[PDB]
């Protein structure tokens, strides 16, 4: 659009790369939750995936986001550290 | 008020202005009986008539005070099923009573603090008195009171979707999915959590919703 | 005041209550089902009879 | 506003102004602005024709008890305080013991002024200002201060001997007890409705007798600094409690001879077996010493902040905070002379010594009174 | 002695059988003479029976009971400004009320606690008389008489242990003042110990931030002075031996923000100690960790006050919370308003961490709203993970909408009236609905102004404004000034910043005129219009379709959207014409309004309300003279009348208006004054410079249930309106208005009062600089 300025948008609850080093595939959700807590989005019908995603928009030049979802098994043992960058 | 009279002299004059509907004169009468006989022969049924008089006179905390009086007075009575209905019935009047109804405006995008209270008392009615004459009424209210929360929870799920706070889209829409499956606001919020996932690059998790979109297409 | 105001009552709306919520219930696939009654939603469908709304009489 | 604001309580001020005895002043010798509205137990001493009189504004004099001539004059309006040239502001009375004028100030300072010229014999900051007049004896400047401390200084430099709280006032609960030296023991009343004997030598409690009510949970007089000063008629301590409750009791144990635990009394003197009083309503009565049995009463002066009842020229002389002087029958009750010498009112102690009656009003200051 | 009958005399609230169950012996239970005496105390144990006489007729119990209940009323006589429910709270604390057990003995402990109420007030020159007035069947009225003379007043404070700072300046510093000179009034003062409890703490912070850190107030002795008012205070303190803030030893869970902590601990190691800023600087961390999400930034400072070098060293123990506390947020008090309109007025977001400054700024947008009463919240930390806070935004909304009306005694000059109604929050949607106009014989007006403020969620203020003035000036309606004024403007608000907002709109000015007045600047503008109409006649008609372009910009840093107290909002209003317009011109206008609180409690606030404008032509083509500037009336200047400030229009030798009412509504016409005259109302200038100086003042006689609805604000108005092209060659027996020196001046107070349909403002203003044609009515009452 012709304007460039935006009241830029927000909403992380992500995990940093330090947080990737804090946990590992195999740890419990609690073992994440001692170190990282729980996210503000988790799996509601499937196996426990702890959705920690960043969001932010720069003005008329895209959107920055850092997704990081933590698929545990049903026992809670971590099975996937699924980090996604922007897009 | 009315001074110390016989209880029925206050009551039959009160019973007129209830039949007349002159609640402000009935409340002038009905309290004046309980001014002198709050233990009296009518004072148990004065309170039921007071919840009848106050709530009809828009004395809704006063009705609910007359309820909590009669809660403290008669924790059981032949008209607690009246009262437990009358609690939520006043609480429905406590929730949404604006003048915008004749102008065609939704009021279940507005705070259901007291429909939440009315959800309690109507459900406390249909549990605590599951066969009363008010139970058949309040049962259907509760499903609509569920829908009143549903459109209210749709009103914020609308808001976060156009906000694009897709984490807040999920947590609000999952709240609807904790709350009710039955209204159309269930199935209309159904692609929006799916929408949040594709916007949060959880396309595969959106496919899990797309299965539900497929399964609850009908 | 001291005038013919021609309104004094206070009722709770209509029977949109009795025009209660539609039916779009959970038919989700396997691994997609989750609890859908969490909250104050404890409504025993109790048609122990008696009149309704404006037909229901209260005093 | 001011035509309508008040709902205050009455007085019966003054029936029977008598001039059977003619009353007058001997002369007027005003020292400036002395007590003022700032009430204090500061009052001059009269002996040897020397009116050792001072005002709280600073001007410290010896006036003559012949004409109010300056026997000396100094000033305590000096650099004392947080600011240079600040006034006297004296709590304790004008105590002359030897060639020093010992005065407790409200600045928690205690001075000695050389009685020949008023020059500073010594100075000492003390702990709390003097609730009672400085009793300077045994080398010990024995003062019941406003924090209820039995404090003694030296009477030659002000070297503090001890400081011991006896009955602690809870806020500044006004139990007026002059620290009385009797039989080698410090005999002080209480700020909360007690009375005590302490050791005079270093402040060791011989006993303290819990007497009667104080401010709080039985709420009592605030309209007077209640004269809990013990009058030790040798074996019997005579004092009030802080609610005014009168008790005659042992000096050595505090065991009760008799008590009038109904009291509201403001001022009291033991005039033989005719104990004269000032009640809370400033009703006058003449009490015994084996009980507080009334010999006579008077309700003429009423709700007027009187002075201590003194006997000068054979009649009971009582001033007031109306500046009026009244000569009550030392017999049954009634006026023998009545004077107005003042309207600015007396918060002083009447000194009926050196042939005169030495009073000083609040700002209509020192009036030498005779009849 | 087994009882055949129990005689239940005199109960009157406790029932006859309720008397029976309270008895230790029942009718048919064996009655003992001990159990007779047990029946004495047990009916006394009810607390409703003042006298109980248990007797028996051999064994037939005859229980003569006299009863305490219903107090049928409690009357308060002598009931001066210490009001009676709190005096009834003394009764309510003692279990005494209307409809109550009356122990008639309990009069004194009432009057104790009634005078203990004054004692807690600080009054004791008061006498309380609980008088029992008996009512039927046992009943009683508690008529209560209060002889409340006067409470205690601040007289003196002395401080011992203090030798550096003077008491009297600290007396003036804290609420200890009592000095109102006869040549100087600094207000008036009075005693309460709760003030002095706080005044200790102000003194506690006093020697603190000097550096005295062994400073302690030992005790305090306010004398129990024989007047029952005399506050003569003896304070014992320890001065505290000034210590220097000489090192920070900040530690604990620094959360990796240690440098960001360290800038907050950038101190001068050796300056005199300031624990107050130390207390402040801990909060700076807590906002900063609150900016980082840590809504539990536990910070524990510890002053190692080193008296060996007269210094302070400052251990600080920090513990951050966790970041993603803001799980979601809740909103309470949106029961009539559209919640999402309120929910979009926040910067703190669900499903992320916390910015501590996002919420109150989001609360500030809600504070800049106006249709609210409260902007509160509840920071509900949900128990569970370190990511669970659901911030429950409790708010309270306010009445919206407004009506206004002038005067004019309708259905007498025809059914004719003045209109104007506002809603502004249309059924809680926030739709700015305000519509004005009038239906009259002399003119017909309607004007709407409707805004969808959030046509898009950017704050896209879909503000459509229309108007239609069928002006005719009906003396013949085609002899005086006729005007079919109508036209449109839609205008939209544009985000610049989150407190800065641009505006732009469009001009369509379709006015159609006739029969215009014999005056200079009316024709003089028309001569710049290329027209040359007649001066000696009102024979001239005029259609315009002026095509302008509107614009604007909004500053917004000022507290309430309806009743602010600190800050300012600046709002540019201007217009320019476009190619295609019937006249090439412009007009730009600007008004200022700042809020400068005199009081730090902000009860007294300067309101600098100024008005500036300048409008002119775009070359040859001129600004229309109806776009001249004006003042007076009630606009912002009062005492004067409306549009009486400005240049005055100069009439002409003229006969025909095409009608004049016979020596009525004259315009230098055939009904007299056929010469160059001058009218008395202002035609107004091409420049505006007027201002008003308003001063918020609290009221001591109005209860705060609606004293907060009242803004007593004093003004002193001044200013000129003057035309920077007003000549002296054309206005030679007529005043010049090309210099800013025609400066009118007035003063007075505004009388604000919130009705259910908004504030109702009134005034009485006295003009003081008056000039030609300054028409005046000193009383001003607005709706």
Swiss-Prot record, chain A:
GO MF terms, alphabetically ordered: protein-macromolecule adaptor activity
Subcellular location: Cell outer membrane
Main location: membrane
UniProt keyword list: Cell outer membrane, Lipoprotein, Membrane, Palmitate, Signal
Regions that span the bilayer: none
Domain of life: Bacteria
UniProt KW Iron-sulfur keyword: no
BP-aspect Gene Ontology terms: Gram-negative-bacterium-type cell outer membrane assembly; protein insertion into membrane
Any single Gene Ontology cellular-component annotation: Bam protein complex
Topology versus the membrane: Lipid-anchor
Residue ranges that the Swiss-Prot or TrEMBL entry lists as coiled coil: none
Functional summary from the UniProt entry: Part of the outer membrane protein assembly complex, which is involved in assembly and insertion of beta-barrel proteins into the outer membrane.
Family: Belongs to the BamE family.
Name of protein: Outer membrane protein assembly factor BamE
Organism listed in the record: Escherichia coli O6:H1 (strain CFT073 / ATCC 700928 / UPEC)
Upper lineage: Bacteria, Pseudomonadati, Pseudomonadota, Gammaproteobacteria, Enterobacterales
Gene: bamE
Span covered, complete protein: 24 to 110 of 113
UniProtKB/Swiss-Prot annotation, chain B:
A UniProt-annotated Pfam family: YfiO
GO biological process: Gram-negative-bacterium-type cell outer membrane assembly; protein insertion into membrane
Single GO cellular component term: Bam protein complex
InterPro entries cross-referenced by the UniProt entry: BamD, BamD-like, TPR-like_helical_dom_sf
Annotated localization: Cell outer membrane
Record membrane topology: Lipid-anchor
Keywords carried by this UniProt record: Cell outer membrane, Lipoprotein, Membrane, Palmitate, Signal
Principal location class: membrane
Subunit annotation: Part of the Bam complex, which is composed of the outer membrane protein BamA, and four lipoproteins BamB, BamC, BamD and BamE.
Family that this chain belongs to: Belongs to the BamD family.
PANTHER family: OUTER MEMBRANE PROTEIN ASSEMBLY FACTOR BAMD, SOLUBLE LYTIC MUREIN TRANSGLYCOSYLASE-RELATED
Task of the protein: Part of the outer membrane protein assembly complex, which is involved in assembly and insertion of beta-barrel proteins into the outer membrane. Constitutes, with BamA, the core component of the assembly machinery.
Record-given protein name: Outer membrane protein assembly factor BamD
Organism lineage string: Bacteria, Pseudomonadati, Pseudomonadota, Gammaproteobacteria, Enterobacterales
From Swiss-Prot, chain E:
One Pfam family matching this protein: Omp85
Keywords of the record: Cell outer membrane, Membrane, Repeat, Signal, Transmembrane, Transmembrane beta strand
Subcellular location: Cell outer membrane
PROSITE patterns: POTRA
Transmembrane segments: none
Gene3D superfamilies documented for this protein: membrane protein fhac (3.10.20.310), membrane protein fhac: a member of the omp85/tpsb transporter family (2.40.160.50)
Domain POTRA: 1-68, 69-149, 152-240, 243-321, 324-398
GO term, biological process aspect, one: protein insertion into membrane
GO cellular component annotations of the record: Bam protein complex
Protein's job: Part of the outer membrane protein assembly complex, which is involved in assembly and insertion of beta-barrel proteins into the outer membrane. Constitutes, with BamD, the core component of the assembly machinery.
HAMAP family recorded: OM_assembly_BamA
PANTHER family: OUTER MEMBRANE PROTEIN ASSEMBLY FACTOR BAMA, SORTING AND ASSEMBLY MACHINERY SAMM50 PROTEIN FAMILY MEMBER
Similarity section: Belongs to the BamA family.
Summary of subunit composition and partner proteins: Part of the Bam complex, which is composed of the outer membrane protein BamA, and four lipoproteins BamB, BamC, BamD and BamE.
Name the record gives this protein: Outer membrane protein assembly factor BamA
Organism classification: Bacteria, Pseudomonadati, Pseudomonadota, Gammaproteobacteria, Enterobacterales
């Amino acid at each position: 659009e012709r304007v460039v300025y935006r009241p830029d948008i927000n909403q992380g609850n992500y995990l940093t790369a330090n947080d990737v080093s804090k946990i590992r595939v195999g740890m419990t959700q609690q073992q994440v939750a001692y170190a990282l807590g729980t996210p503000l989005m988790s799996d509601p019908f499937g196996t426990n995936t702890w959705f920690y995603v960043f969001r932010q928009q720069p003005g008329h030049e895209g959107v920055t986001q850092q997704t990081l979802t933590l698929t545990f098994n049903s026992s809670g043992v971590l099975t996937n550290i699924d980090n996604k960058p922007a897009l | 008020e009315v001074p110390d009279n016989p209880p029925n002299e206050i009551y039959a004059t009160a019973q007129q202005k209830l039949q007349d509907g002159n609640w402000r004169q009935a409340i002038t009468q009905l309290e004046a009986l309980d001014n002198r006989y709050p233990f009296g022969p009518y004072s148990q049924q004065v309170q039921l008539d007071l919840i009848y008089a106050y709530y009809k006179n828009a004395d809704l905390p006063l009705a609910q005070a007359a309820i909590d009086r009669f809660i403290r007075l008669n924790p059981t009575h032949p008209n607690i099923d009246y009262v437990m209905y009358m609690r939520g019935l006043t609480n429905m009047a406590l929730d949404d009573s604006a003048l915008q109804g004749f102008f065609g405006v939704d009021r279940s995008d507005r705070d259901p603090q007291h429909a939440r209270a009315a959800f309690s008392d109507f459900s406390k009615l249909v549990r605590g008195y599951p066969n009363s004459q008010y139970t058949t009424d309040a049962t259907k209210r509760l499903v609509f009171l569920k829908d009143r929360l549903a459109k209210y929870e749709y009103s914020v799920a609308e808001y976060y979707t156009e906000r694009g706070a897709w984490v807040a889209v999920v947590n609000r829409v999952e709240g609807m999915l904790r709350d009710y499956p039955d209204t159309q606001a269930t199935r209309d919020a159904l692609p929006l959590m799916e929408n949040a996932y594709r916007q949060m690059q959880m396309n595969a998790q959106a496919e899990k919703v797309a299965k539900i979109i497929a399964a609850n297409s009908s | 005041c001291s005038s013919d105001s021609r309104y004094k009552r206070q009722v709770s709306g209509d029977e949109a209550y009795l025009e209660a919520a539609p039916l779009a219930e959970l038919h989700a696939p396997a691994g997609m089902i989750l609890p859908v009654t969490s909250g104050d939603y404890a409504i025993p469908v109790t048609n122990g009879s008696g009149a309704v709304g404006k037909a229901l009489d209260i005093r | 506003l001011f035509n309508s604001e008040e709902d205050v309580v009455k007085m019966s001020p003054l029936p029977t102004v008598e001039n059977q005895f003619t009353p007058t002043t001997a002369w007027s010798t005003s020292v400036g602005s002395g007590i003022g509205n700032f009430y204090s137990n500061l009052h001059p001493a009269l002996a040897d024709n020397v009116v050792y009189a001072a005002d709280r504004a600073g001007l410290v004099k010896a006036l003559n008890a012949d004409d109010g001539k300056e026997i000396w004059s100094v000033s305590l309006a000096e650099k004392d305080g947080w600011f240079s040239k600040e006034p006297a502001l004296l709590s304790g009375g004008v105590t002359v013991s030897g060639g020093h004028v010992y005065i407790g100030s409200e600045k928690a300072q205690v001075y000695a002024l050389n009685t020949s010229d008023g020059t500073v014999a010594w100075q000492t900051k003390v702990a709390g200002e003097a609730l009672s007049r400085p009793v300077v004896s045994d080398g010990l400047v024995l003062i019941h201060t406003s924090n209820g401390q039995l404090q003694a200084l030296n009477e030659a430099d002000g070297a503090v001997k001890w400081t011991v709280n006896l009955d602690m006032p809870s806020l500044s609960l006004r139990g007026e007890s002059a620290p009385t030296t009797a039989f080698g023991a410090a005999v002080v009343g209480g700020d909360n409705g007690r009375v005590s004997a302490v050791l005079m030598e270093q402040g060791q409690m011989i006993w303290q007798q819990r007497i009667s009510q104080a401010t709080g949970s039985t709420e009592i007089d605030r309209l007077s600094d209640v004269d809990t000063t013990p009058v030790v008629v040798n074996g019997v301590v005579f004092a009030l409690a802080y609610n005014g409750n009168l008790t005659a009791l042992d000096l050595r144990s505090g065991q009760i001879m008799w008590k009038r635990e109904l009291g509201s009394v403001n001022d009291f003197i033991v005039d033989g077996n005719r104990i004269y009083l000032v009640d809370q309503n400033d009703r006058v009565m003449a009490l015994t010493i084996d009980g507080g049995v009334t010999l006579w009463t008077q309700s003429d002066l009423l709700h007027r902040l009187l002075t201590s009842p003194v006997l000068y020229n054979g009649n009971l002389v009582v001033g007031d905070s109306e500046g009026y002087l009244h000569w009550i029958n030392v017999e049954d009750g009634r006026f023998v002379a009545q004077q107005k010498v003042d309207s600015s009112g007396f918060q002083t102690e009447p000194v009926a010594a050196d042939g005169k009656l030495l009073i000083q009003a609040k700002d209509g200051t020192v009036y030498s009174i005779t009849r | 002695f087994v009882v055949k009958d129990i005689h239940f005399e005199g109960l009157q609230r406790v029932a006859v059988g309720a008397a029976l169950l309270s008895m230790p012996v029942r009718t048919g239970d064996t009655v003992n003479d001990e159990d007779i005496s047990n029946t004495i105390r047990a009916l006394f144990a009810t607390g409703n029976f003042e006298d109980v006489r248990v007797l028996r007729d051999g064994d037939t119990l005859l229980v003569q009971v006299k009863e305490r209940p219903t107090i049928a009323s409690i009357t308060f006589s002598g009931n001066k400004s210490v009001k009676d429910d709190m005096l009834k709270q003394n009764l309510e604390a003692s279990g005494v009320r209307v409809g109550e057990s009356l122990d008639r003995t309990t009069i004194a402990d009432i009057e104790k606690g009634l005078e203990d109420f004054y004692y807690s007030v600080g009054k004791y020159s008061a006498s309380v008389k609980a008088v029992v007035t008996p009512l039927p069947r046992n009943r009683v009225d508690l008529k209560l008489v209060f002889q409340e003379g006067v409470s205690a007043e601040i007289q003196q404070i002395n401080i011992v242990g203090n030798h550096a700072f003077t008491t009297d300046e600290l007396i003036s510093h804290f609420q200890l003042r009592d000095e109102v000179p006869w040549w100087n009034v600094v207000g008036d003062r009075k005693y309460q110990k709760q003030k002095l409890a706080g005044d200790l703490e102000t003194l506690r912070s006093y020697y603190l931030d000097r550096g005295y850190a062994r400073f302690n107030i030992d005790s305090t002795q306010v004398s129990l002075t024989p007047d029952k008012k005399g506050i003569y205070v003896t304070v014992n303190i320890t001065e505290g031996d000034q210590y220097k803030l000489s090192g920070v030893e900040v530690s604990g869970n620094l959360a990796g923000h240690s440098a960001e902590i360290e800038q907050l601990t950038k101190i001068e190691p050796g300056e005199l100690y300031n624990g107050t800023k130390v207390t402040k600087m801990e909060d700076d961390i807590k906002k900063l960790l609150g900016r980082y999400g840590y809504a539990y930034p536990r910070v524990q400072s510890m002053p190692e006050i080193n008296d060996a070098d007269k210094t302070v060293k400052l251990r600080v123990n920090v513990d951050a919370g966790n970041r993603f506390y803001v799980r979601k947020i809740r909103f309470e008090g949106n029961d009539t308003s559209k919640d999402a309109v309120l929910r979009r007025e926040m910067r703190q977001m669900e499903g992320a961490w916390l910015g501590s400054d996002l919420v109150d700024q989001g609360k500030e947008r809600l504070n800049r709203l106006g249709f609210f009463e409260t902007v509160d919240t509840d920071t509900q930390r949900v128990p569970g993970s370190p990511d669970q806070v659901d911030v429950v935004y409790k708010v309270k909304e306010r009445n919206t909408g407004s009506f206004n009306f002038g005067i004019g005694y309708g259905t007498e000059s025809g059914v004719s009236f003045q209109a104007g109604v506002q809603q502004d929050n249309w059924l809680g949607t926030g739709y700015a609905v305000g519509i004005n106009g009038t239906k009259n014989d002399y003119q017909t007006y309607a004007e709407l102004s409707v805004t969808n403020p959030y046509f898009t969620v950017d704050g896209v203020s879909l503000g459509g404004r229309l108007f239609y003035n069928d002006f005719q000036a009906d003396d013949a309606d085609l002899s005086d000034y006729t005007n079919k004024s109508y036209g449109t403007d839609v205008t939209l608000g544009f985000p610049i910043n989150e407190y800065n907002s641009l505006r732009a709109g469009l001009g369509y000015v379709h006015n159609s005129l006739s029969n215009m007045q014999p005056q200079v600047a009316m024709w003089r503008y028309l001569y710049s219009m290329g027209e040359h109409p007649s001066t000696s006649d009102q024979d001239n008609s005029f259609k315009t379709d002026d095509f302008t372009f509107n614009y604007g910009w909004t500053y917004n840093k000022l507290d309430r959207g309806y009743f602010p107290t600190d800050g300012s909002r600046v709002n540019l209003t201007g217009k320019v014409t476009i190619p295609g317009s019937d006249n090439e011109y412009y007009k730009v206008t600007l008004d200022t309004a700042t809020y400068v609180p005199i009081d730090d409690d902000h009860k007294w606030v300067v309101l600098g309300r100024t008005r500036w404008g300048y409008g002119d032509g775009l070359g040859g083509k001129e600004m229309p003279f109806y776009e001249n500037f004006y003042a007076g009336g009630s606009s912002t200047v009062r005492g004067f009348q409306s549009n009486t400030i400005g240049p005055k229009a100069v009439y002409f030798p003229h006969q025909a208006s095409n009608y004049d009412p016979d020596y009525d509504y004259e315009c230098a016409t055939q009904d007299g004054a056929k010469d160059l005259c001058k009218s008395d109302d202002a035609v107004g200038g091409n420049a505006m410079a007027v201002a008003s100086l308003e001063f918020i003042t609290p009221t001591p006689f109005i209860s705060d249930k609606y004293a907060n609805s009242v803004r007593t604000s004093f003004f002193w108005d001044m200013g000129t309106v003057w035309d920077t092209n007003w000549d002296s060659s054309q206005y030679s027996g007529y005043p010049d208005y090309s210099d800013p020196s025609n400066i009118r001046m007035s003063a007075g107070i505004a009388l604000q009062w919130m009705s259910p349909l908004g504030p109702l403002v009134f005034s009485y203003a006295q003009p003081f600089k008056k000039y030609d044609g300054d028409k005046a009515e000193q009383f001003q009452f607005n709706i």
